[PDB]
Write an enzyme that holds these catalytic residues in place. Structure first.
Site, short mmCIF file in Angstrom:
data_model
loop_
_atom_site.label_atom_id
_atom_site.label_comp_id
_atom_site.label_asym_id
_atom_site.label_seq_id
_atom_site.Cartn_x
_atom_site.Cartn_y
_atom_site.Cartn_z
NE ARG A 216 45.05 -0.12 92.30
CZ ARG A 216 44.17 0.01 91.31
NH1 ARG A 216 44.39 -0.62 90.16
NH2 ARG A 216 43.08 0.76 91.48
CG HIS A 243 38.98 -8.72 100.19
ND1 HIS A 243 39.36 -8.52 98.88
CD2 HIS A 243 38.78 -10.06 100.33
CE1 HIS A 243 39.39 -9.68 98.25
NE2 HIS A 243 39.04 -10.63 99.10
CB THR A 341 44.11 -12.01 98.21
OG1 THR A 341 42.74 -11.72 98.50
CG2 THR A 341 44.99 -11.53 99.39
CE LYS A 441 33.42 -30.39 89.32
NZ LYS A 441 34.42 -30.03 88.27
CE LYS A 527 36.04 -13.12 95.97
NZ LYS A 527 36.32 -11.74 95.51
N1 LIG Z 1 36.09 -9.16 87.68
C1 LIG Z 1 35.90 -10.47 88.10
N2 LIG Z 1 35.16 -11.37 87.35
C2 LIG Z 1 35.00 -12.66 87.81
N3 LIG Z 1 35.54 -13.20 88.92
C3 LIG Z 1 36.29 -12.33 89.67
C4 LIG Z 1 36.52 -10.98 89.31
N4 LIG Z 1 37.31 -10.37 90.30
C5 LIG Z 1 37.60 -11.31 91.20
N5 LIG Z 1 36.99 -12.55 90.87
C6 LIG Z 1 36.96 -13.86 91.64
O1 LIG Z 1 37.54 -13.56 92.86
C7 LIG Z 1 38.66 -14.43 93.08
C8 LIG Z 1 39.73 -13.81 94.05
O2 LIG Z 1 39.06 -13.62 95.22
P1 LIG Z 1 39.95 -12.94 96.56
O3 LIG Z 1 41.27 -13.52 96.63
O4 LIG Z 1 39.06 -12.88 97.70
O5 LIG Z 1 40.37 -11.33 95.92
C9 LIG Z 1 39.73 -10.71 95.35
O6 LIG Z 1 38.63 -10.95 94.87
C10 LIG Z 1 40.19 -9.24 95.08
C11 LIG Z 1 41.74 -9.20 95.12
S1 LIG Z 1 41.95 -7.58 94.30
C12 LIG Z 1 40.52 -7.73 93.40
C13 LIG Z 1 40.27 -6.35 92.62
N6 LIG Z 1 40.80 -5.13 92.53
C14 LIG Z 1 40.01 -4.27 91.59
C15 LIG Z 1 40.29 -2.90 91.24
C16 LIG Z 1 39.44 -2.19 90.39
C17 LIG Z 1 38.26 -2.78 89.83
O7 LIG Z 1 37.50 -2.00 88.99
C18 LIG Z 1 37.92 -4.09 90.19
C19 LIG Z 1 38.83 -4.82 91.04
S2 LIG Z 1 38.79 -6.53 91.66
N7 LIG Z 1 39.80 -8.78 93.65
C20 LIG Z 1 39.28 -14.74 91.72
O8 LIG Z 1 40.11 -15.83 91.89
C21 LIG Z 1 37.91 -14.94 90.96
O9 LIG Z 1 37.37 -16.17 91.23
#
Ligand SMILES: Nc1ncnc2c1ncn2[C@@H]1O[C@H](COP(=O)(O)OC(=O)[C@H]2CSC(c3nc4ccc(O)cc4s3)=N2)[C@@H](O)[C@H]1O
Length: 539
Positions: A216, A243, A341, A441, A527
């Site tokens: 990273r 997070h 994550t 669905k 979310k």
């Molecule tokens: N851009 C997206 N478009 C549509 N859906 C998305 C998007 N990003 C996530 N998801 C949903 O989020 C779900 C995981 O959710 P989580 O495990 O709680 O972790 C997370 O979200 C965290 C884990 S690091 C992260 C990021 N580090 C950076 C750094 C720079 C920046 O400029 C933007 C970002 S974003 N995200 C995944 O599976 C999708 O469904």
């Protein structure tokens, strides 16, 4: 076959040696030697921690933790809202190879117990606001030996504050200039234990190694994939530090010497005033705040001329909302990242010089990606929707003490299955459709809420939206929407339904109706809470 695998490019420069603690130390030390540099600024209080102060605090705390008796691969926890002190124990632990378990400060007692039982921290750093709930749960959890209060200058009721812990366990004449972080095997030593439910089941602990973190740190300084603001620039983040979205962006900001302006809760006026007053050039947002930037009249009341890097992550961003933000701020485009994550940080990022509205960018260095058919599992070519899968050097070591769950998300060929539906175009730009579990669905169709949410957000009177399926005897689920109206504007349910119907195929119509609400239920990383939506849309 491999023809349809998409590869990130080479890093602009090779990966730097050392642990994540060694790389953070070198960066804090560099900026501490330039006069007046500020690392952290609390927007609510205007209080700062300088890079010199942060170097002193992190090194002294690391020495204190060693004298207290912590060893490599012990574990601490941090349970706190975003504040100036949050990262002091994070960085100090990385210096000495102690794993860090951030714990949501809004957790209930039962969620707290379940998270702490996975990571079993020996010390918990808390805030004044979380002290009581941490005290409550500690009575049940024998492995917790010590509580330290981050943001109090005095001990409280038998519990020690950060400054008195450091005074007790380190000499006042401790020489910071000579302190040296520990060296250890960065590929094996866990750095962070982060909470994630993953693709299915109860919340788990995601192990990210020092190697995951330094990858990273390569991205964030990369002239193509990194932040496009220079050291010393002010950046404002609204993302929770506990997070992965907030943890691994903010840690990277230290390595870039940015002035990190933080908030523990979002307020529109304070947000805008803070962008103006600190001459903020970059900000890290979620899609609801992108719609705010695109639509709110309040934006015109502040001097935001310095702002040029506007980033979104965490949840689907509408193509049209992003274009409206770029247009309003007279920018060539917006910044976006996508990750989980389990992948440490973003593994698809909008590269410098390469924007495509609607796309969250291209695969980052050290990664590859593929799109797999939901039915067959075969690898798909461009412009074909399937499940997004990833392989690369930020993929987690696995779930804490849960090899079964690890194997369910990382397959026998080594690919992490994201649970997200997406596709990539002929140039390698990726587009996120929705989480697979979010699909509605309706009979034999699968309708994507983000597609309907994007249409709703095209309406000039709609400032936020959330779509899900409501139960139906005949059809299974009917698509339905919660809509937030711009203050002073008015729409009827029929107007909204007809607006969507004029743009979508029959199966995607809002047959479940529309409810107007004051806010969409969403989590702290964007979310959308589909269950909360259904409860509103049933009432
Ligand atoms: N851009 C997206 N478009 C549509 N859906 C998305 C998007 N990003 C996530 N998801 C949903 O989020 C779900 C995981 O959710 P989580 O495990 O709680 O972790 C997370 O979200 C965290 C884990 S690091 C992260 C990021 N580090 C950076 C750094 C720079 C920046 O400029 C933007 C970002 S974003 N995200 C995944 O599976 C999708 O469904």
């Amino acid at each position: 076959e491999d023809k349809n695998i998409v590869y990130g490019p080479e890093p602009f420069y090779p990966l730097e040696d050392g642990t994540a603690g060694e790389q953070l130390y070198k960066a804090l030390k560099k900026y501490a030697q330039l006069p007046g540099t500020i690392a952290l600024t609390d927007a609510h209080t205007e209080e700062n921690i300088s890079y010199a102060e942060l170097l002193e605090l992190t090194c002294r705390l690391a020495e204190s933790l060693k004298n207290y008796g912590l060893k490599q691969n012990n574990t601490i926890a941090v349970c706190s809202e975003n504040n100036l002190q949050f990262f002091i124990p994070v960085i100090a632990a990385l210096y000495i190879g102690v794993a860090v378990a951030p714990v949501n400060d809004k957790y209930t007692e039962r969620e707290l117990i379940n998270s702490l039982n996975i990571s079993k921290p020996t010390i918990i750093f808390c805030s004044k606001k979380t002290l009581q709930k941490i005290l409550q749960v500690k009575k049940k959890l024998s492995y917790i030996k010590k509580i330290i209060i981050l943001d109090s200058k005095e001990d409280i009721g038998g519990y020690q504050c950060l400054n008195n812990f450091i005074s007790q366990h380190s000499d006042a004449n401790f020489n910071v200039s000579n302190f040296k972080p520990n060296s250890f095997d960065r590929d094996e030593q866990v750095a962070l234990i982060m909470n994630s439910s993953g693709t299915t089941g109860l919340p788990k602990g995601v192990m990210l190694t020092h190697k995951n973190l330094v990858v990273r740190f390569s991205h964030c300084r990369d002239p193509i994939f990194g932040n496009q603001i220079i050291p010393g620039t002010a950046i404002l983040t609204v993302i929770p530090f506990h997070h992965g979205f907030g943890m691994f962006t903010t840690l990277g900001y230290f390595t870039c010497g940015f002035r990190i302006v933080l908030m523990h809760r979002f307020e529109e006026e304070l947000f805008l005033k803070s962008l103006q007053d600190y001459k903020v050039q970059s900000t890290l947002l979620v899609p609801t705040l992108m719609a705010f930037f695109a639509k709110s009249p309040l934006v015109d009341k502040y001097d935001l001329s310095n702002l040029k890097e506007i980033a979104s992550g965490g949840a689907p961003l509408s193509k049209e909302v992003g274009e409206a933000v770029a247009k309003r701020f007279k920018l060539p485009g917006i910044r976006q990242g996508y990750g989980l994550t389990e992948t440490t940080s973003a593994i698809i990022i909008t590269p410098e010089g390469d924007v495509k509205p609607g796309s969250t960018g291209k695969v980052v260095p050290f990664f590859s990606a593929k799109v797999v058919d939901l039915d067959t599992g075969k690898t798909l070519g461009p412009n074909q929707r399937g499940e997004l899968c990833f392989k690369g050097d930020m993929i987690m070591k696995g779930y804490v003490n849960n090899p079964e769950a690890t194997k369910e998300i990382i397959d026998k060929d080594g690919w992490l299955h994201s649970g997200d539906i997406g596709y990539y175009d002929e140039d390698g730009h990726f587009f996120i459709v929705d989480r697979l579990k979010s699909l509605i669905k309706y009979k034999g169709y699968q309708v994507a809420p983000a597609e309907l949410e994007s249409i709703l957000l095209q309406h000039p009177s709609i400032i936020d939206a959330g779509v899900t399926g409501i139960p139906d005897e005949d059809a299974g689920e009917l698509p339905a929407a919660c809509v937030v109206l711009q203050p002073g504007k008015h729409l009827t349910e029929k107007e909204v339904i007809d607006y969507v119907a004029s743009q979508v195929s029959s199966a995607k119509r809002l047959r479940g109706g529309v409810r107007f609400v004051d806010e969409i239920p969403k989590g702290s990383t964007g979310k959308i809470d589909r269950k909360a939506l259904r409860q509103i849309l049933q009432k």
